[PDB]
Amino acid sequence: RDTPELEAYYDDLAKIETGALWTVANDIEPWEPTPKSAPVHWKWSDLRREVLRAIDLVRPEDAGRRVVYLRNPQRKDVSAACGWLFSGIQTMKAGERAGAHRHAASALRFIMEGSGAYTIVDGHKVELGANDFVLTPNGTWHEHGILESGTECIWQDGLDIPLTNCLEANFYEVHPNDYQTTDIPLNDSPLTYGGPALLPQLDKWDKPYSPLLKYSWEPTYEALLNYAKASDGSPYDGLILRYTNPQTGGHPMLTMGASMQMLRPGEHTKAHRHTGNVIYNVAKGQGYSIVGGKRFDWSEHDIFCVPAWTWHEHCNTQERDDACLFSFNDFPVMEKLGFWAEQALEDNGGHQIVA
Amino acid sequence: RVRDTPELEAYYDDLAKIETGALWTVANDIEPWEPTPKSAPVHWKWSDLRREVLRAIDLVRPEDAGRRVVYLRNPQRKDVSAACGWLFSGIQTMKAGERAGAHRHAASALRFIMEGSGAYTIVDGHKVELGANDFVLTPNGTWHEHGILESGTECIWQDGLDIPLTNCLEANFYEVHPNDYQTTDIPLNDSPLTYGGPALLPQLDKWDKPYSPLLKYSWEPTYEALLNYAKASDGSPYDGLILRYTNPQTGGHPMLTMGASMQMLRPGEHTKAHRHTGNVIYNVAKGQGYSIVGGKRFDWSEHDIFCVPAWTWHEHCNTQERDDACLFSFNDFPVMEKLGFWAEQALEDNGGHQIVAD
Amino acid sequence: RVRDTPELEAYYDDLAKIETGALWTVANDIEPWEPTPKSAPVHWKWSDLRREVLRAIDLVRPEDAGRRVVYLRNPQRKDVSAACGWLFSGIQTMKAGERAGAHRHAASALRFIMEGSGAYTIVDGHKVELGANDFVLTPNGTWHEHGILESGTECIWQDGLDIPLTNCLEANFYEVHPNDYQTTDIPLNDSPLTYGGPALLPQLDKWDKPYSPLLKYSWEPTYEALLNYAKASDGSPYDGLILRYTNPQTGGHPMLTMGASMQMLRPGEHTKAHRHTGNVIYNVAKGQGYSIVGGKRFDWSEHDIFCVPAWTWHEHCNTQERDDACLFSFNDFPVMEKLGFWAEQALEDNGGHQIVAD
Amino acid sequence: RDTPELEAYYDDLAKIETGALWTVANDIEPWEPTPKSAPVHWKWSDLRREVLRAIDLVRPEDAGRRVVYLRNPQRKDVSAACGWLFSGIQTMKAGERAGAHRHAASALRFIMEGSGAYTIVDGHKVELGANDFVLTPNGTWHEHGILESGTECIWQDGLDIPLTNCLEANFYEVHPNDYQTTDIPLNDSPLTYGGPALLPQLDKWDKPYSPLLKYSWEPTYEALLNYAKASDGSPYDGLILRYTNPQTGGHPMLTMGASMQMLRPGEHTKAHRHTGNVIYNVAKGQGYSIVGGKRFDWSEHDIFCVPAWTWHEHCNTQERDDACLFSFNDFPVMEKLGFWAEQALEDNGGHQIVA
Numbered sequence A, D: 001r002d003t004p005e006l007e008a009y010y011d012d013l014a015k016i017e018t019g020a021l022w023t024v025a026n027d028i029e030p031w032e033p034t035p036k037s038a039p040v041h042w043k044w045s046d047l048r049r050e051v052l053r054a055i056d057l058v059r060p061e062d063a064g065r066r067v068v069y070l071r072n073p074q075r076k077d078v079s080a081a082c083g084w085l086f087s088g089i090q091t092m093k094a095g096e097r098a099g100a101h102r103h104a105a106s107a108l109r110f111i112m113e114g115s116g117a118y119t120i121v122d123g124h125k126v127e128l129g130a131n132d133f134v135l136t137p138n139g140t141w142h143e144h145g146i147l148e149s150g151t152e153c154i155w156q157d158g159l160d161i162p163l164t165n166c167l168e169a170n171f172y173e174v175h176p177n178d179y180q181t182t183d184i185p186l187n188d189s190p191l192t193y194g195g196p197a198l199l200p201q202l203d204k205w206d207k208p209y210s211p212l213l214k215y216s217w218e219p220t221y222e223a224l225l226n227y228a229k230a231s232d233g234s235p236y237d238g239l240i241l242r243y244t245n246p247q248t249g250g251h252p253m254l255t256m257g258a259s260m261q262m263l264r265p266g267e268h269t270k271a272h273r274h275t276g277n278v279i280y281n282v283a284k285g286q287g288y289s290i291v292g293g294k295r296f297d298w299s300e301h302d303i304f305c306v307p308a309w310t311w312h313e314h315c316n317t318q319e320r321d322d323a324c325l326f327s328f329n330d331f332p333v334m335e336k337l338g339f340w341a342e343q344a345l346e347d348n349g350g351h352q353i354v355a
Numbered sequence B, C: 001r002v003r004d005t006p007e008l009e010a011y012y013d014d015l016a017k018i019e020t021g022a023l024w025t026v027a028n029d030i031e032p033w034e035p036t037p038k039s040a041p042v043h044w045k046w047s048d049l050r051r052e053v054l055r056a057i058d059l060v061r062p063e064d065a066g067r068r069v070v071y072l073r074n075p076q077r078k079d080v081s082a083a084c085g086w087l088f089s090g091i092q093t094m095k096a097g098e099r100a101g102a103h104r105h106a107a108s109a110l111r112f113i114m115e116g117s118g119a120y121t122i123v124d125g126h127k128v129e130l131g132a133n134d135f136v137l138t139p140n141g142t143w144h145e146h147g148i149l150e151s152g153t154e155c156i157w158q159d160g161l162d163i164p165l166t167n168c169l170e171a172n173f174y175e176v177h178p179n180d181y182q183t184t185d186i187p188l189n190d191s192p193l194t195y196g197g198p199a200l201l202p203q204l205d206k207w208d209k210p211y212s213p214l215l216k217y218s219w220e221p222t223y224e225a226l227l228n229y230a231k232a233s234d235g236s237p238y239d240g241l242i243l244r245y246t247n248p249q250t251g252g253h254p255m256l257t258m259g260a261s262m263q264m265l266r267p268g269e270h271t272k273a274h275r276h277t278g279n280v281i282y283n284v285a286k287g288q289g290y291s292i293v294g295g296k297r298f299d300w301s302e303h304d305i306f307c308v309p310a311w312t313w314h315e316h317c318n319t320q321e322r323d324d325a326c327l328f329s330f331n332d333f334p335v336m337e338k339l340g341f342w343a344e345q346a347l348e349d350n351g352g353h354q355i356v357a358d
């Protein structure tokens, strides 16, 4: 036990708002990181049913608000899905309309069902189909909706709200007159900045985020097929392409990156771990994944977590069909702050034991 | 007051079964309009600080000798042991003979000398010598050891670390040197002597690290730079004549996560109040005066330490009649700047001065 | 008229003895107010071009077989053999079987296919296949060889080189491959298939060259990109809908010295005239019309070549009623942009159209 | 000889402004560069005498204009000193004054004698002493003069006029009202941006050239002495420091770089060659240099050329005194356009044979 002299010294230190470093929990400087976030897998059958169920059970108040957010069991206090990333599933009918606002939190919206979905980002209107995603970067006036001719749409939102909050950098304001006014032609952004290695001769665009705000499923699929003709990709991800800011080559946003990967028929990757958090969405196909020993058998439009520094591998159970996983992450924040670390699994042939 | 329907409550429980929830059930948005400081402003008098740090020598056990450091503990940040925001700060003491072993960690560190002479650090083979008000960098993942040269005196210094940030972001690594100490034949002070020149770099620059090649930042030349700056400008209305330390190779910040500044307040100067999104820890390098942080007045003198939480009104004052005052600071800024979270705002009311809340 | 004093003339000769002169003796400042084009605008009809290039096959000796190329010679730039400014351009022909050896040089090159199918180039092991209106890069100091695949036809292509610039700046190097040809097992078209995706890069990018990882730029997807661009904009008043090719890894230009553009002119479009500091060489990828360069009218059609000297008024027109016209171009721009020499100016007079000087 | 068929073919090619590549001089693509510029050495005794001599022999017309430009024998047509660089020696008395103008050509002015010399660059006034140099970068309003209390001053001008001209990028205009109007404090630039690894917290300066426009001799000398305590420098240059843009770490200007080197007592460097042109000015000391086999015995304030791809080495003949060479160059244009190449001499111990 401590000496009456020591216990008097710690008490003296507290009086001046100080302490002894030998008195704290030994993992103030840990040998390696250990995630507080736990691996979770969300079944599309459950999500579609419970989100649509919300329409008839929601009050006149709390318009939306009406989101089924993915709560990590170990991340309940900050309502995050993985690490410092927020994710919610939401729905709207044709003609429905949410007012414009801006926040310091960056966001992306990945459509998983329906047609007619749109987003105005700083006057640039963008229409989205299944497996397309739109960017709404930090500080931009954005609003969402469904076109009048559209169907009922269901999408996933990914934000860095928890990161924005914990860093004490959060800001919010509603549009001074509810909705943005713009005469800029529809889909101007993807149509002008969406060409392969191609940019307007005069680039009047000087913002640190991507000028391309919509990333299309079809051309991305087409490009992965092309990548399949010339490379095997990585041992840990297969044919993996990351989305870019075409002005810089860097990530689409300052805090968030996104990727799309293709797994060949019967392919089973090796396992690795890294310092970022990753949230996967199954854009196409059927298979399973092992993350932290736990097995997740996934189908089209399922969602699953991979916490930081957690062993993870992927597998396509289809016999003659490729599988495509969309994913977004906090990679840019890792890379910019020099915290990016990666390590392969040496045990087995590079594969986790499933219990 | 009014409980919502059993239908809704069945739905909430159904959502919990698949590890989800209804967003309208939370409550609360912690005010998304503007940041809420999680740290409290705190002052640390050098009188108390120095006196309590020396006491640790005779009280520390056989073990805990390597951990013999008094850390600045923010009363609202005890859970993560931060001094302010996601920044760690500690006070150490070593004597003429003493030296420590070398380790490497993901966290970045600053070592600002407060008292003494002939302190030294080895960073990846680069040996640097330090005096009062000088500081060194021990950046991400670099081999670093501390000690005092034979000809030196008893030293007291302040450590600055982004430890809470690194743990928080789940990215901290640690390993001791396999040989306990580093073996280096590189000439002494090679870094500040090759990279410390005013707007000058070696013609063939072989440095390939994202952080500064200049690892020691010297008090004397910094002070002389501020005297010169004073001849041509009044600087910022909110800090006086304020220069930030830089990475001479890129012109950016010294380290990827922490920035550092030195500022000179003219005799009798009272600065204007402002807010910003970073967390800043101040060490008084020279002089005497006060500061008002979030309503609280901190009368400081040489080597006092105080911090300013994010989005908190702050202003600085030099009480002296003839002599200038200098405030060293290290901060959170590179993380706010790179992630696009930087914001600043001036106090409009009361002539740019806070109402002092006793 | 009036000779200056023998005292002055003794002084001038004294200055020459130490290899100097009096600045007031020159005369002339070549007009320092604005640039003077050193190149003349020139048109090259495909009819003549193709016809004269094929003739070279039977006329060339045993030697000179490797040099069998008709270069575009600017009449006011014969001394340095440039097509326009400091840019070289030539026309080559190869048949289904033929292939050349590999060499490496400091100059950068573009190879734009004008006629034929199944052309190929190896760049540092990267094998690419080319069709009409596609082009490849053979950047600074890279191992490159050209040829036609077995299944291909007779090909005619245009080479674009910064040879005059490199000689002018005294920096050109040359060496043949020690093994005559390159040995590569890398899968065909690996570069455009891994780097040709719309806003997509391999998660682990291992390319570490200052120039583009994407070496083949394809006509078909470029054309489809312009049709899409047309749905949302009218582009520039001076070029119509104009996209430049980029380095997908940095977002900058494809090579450190040469830029390249493709532009689509809507049916019946007459563009506005402008000046700029670069030199541009145009190849007609699709359609028919005319252009006015420095007063001269050039009625062009598919695969005609013309250049625009620096600081020369130029405008483009599409004569067709239903179909769009496309103009490929490669240019000097990266050198003007990086050295801070870029300047542009619009024609104010005559509704933005030049007076055509017959 | 050529066949009547061939000579008719070349004639046909000329009619359409074309030629045969096998008919041109073989060194269109040379194996390596060979400089047209020749090594030259200008003696300070000659320069001081002939420049001062110009005052009494110049007409009322041609005010200045009154410059003794260093003409390379092989570069007479473009009036360059080396490669594409212009250099002239000029003088002014106290109170003398040249009007403000701007040009696309970048320039630097290296003071070699006298006191009171000044330059206003875009409102920023800068005073210069011996061995100090001021930048007047592309497109900036600049004017020169000597303070009323100053002495007779002699300086060297270094410009990239020939480069600006050959690239067809030259522009010029006189100030709409002759002289710049500014209330910005004297020496504001060196005093605010001249600190070692130190910049103002808010940097309102967004120009691609250096915010530090004056580089001082004394602190640069002081820094070379410090560099001498910890390194041997390069085998080919000794203790060589290059001047920087302190906002970027890059070169002070877009087309021009500058360096200052210290040679230790009795030091004799090895020889190398590179793709840039370099013009040296002897800021302090006495010694010799070998460039292209030719020996140049230099003294304080001498000037000498080193053409591109020409072997060059340096030597301090002083027994117990360091020698300092100032130099400026076209290195940034080489580096930015990827034309930078360097090669050591292997013959001898790395030393040229003097004939």
Ligand SMILES: [Fe+2]
Pocket (backbone or CB within 6 Å): A101, A103, A107, A142
């Ligand atoms: Fe939002």
Ligand SMILES: [Fe+2]
Pocket (backbone or CB within 6 Å): A236, A237, A272, A274, A312
């Ligand atoms: Fe992964």
Ligand SMILES: [Fe+2]
Pocket (backbone or CB within 6 Å): B103, B105, B109, B138, B144
């Ligand atoms: Fe440490």
Ligand SMILES: [Fe+2]
Pocket (backbone or CB within 6 Å): B238, B274, B276, B314
């Ligand atoms: Fe502040």
Ligand SMILES: [Fe+2]
Pocket (backbone or CB within 6 Å): C103, C105, C109, C138, C144
């Ligand atoms: Fe070639």
Ligand SMILES: [Fe+2]
Pocket (backbone or CB within 6 Å): C238, C274, C276, C314
């Ligand atoms: Fe043009």
Ligand SMILES: [Fe+2]
Pocket (backbone or CB within 6 Å): D101, D103, D107, D142
């Ligand atoms: Fe000038």
Ligand SMILES: [Fe+2]
Pocket (backbone or CB within 6 Å): D236, D237, D272, D274, D312
């Ligand atoms: Fe050299």
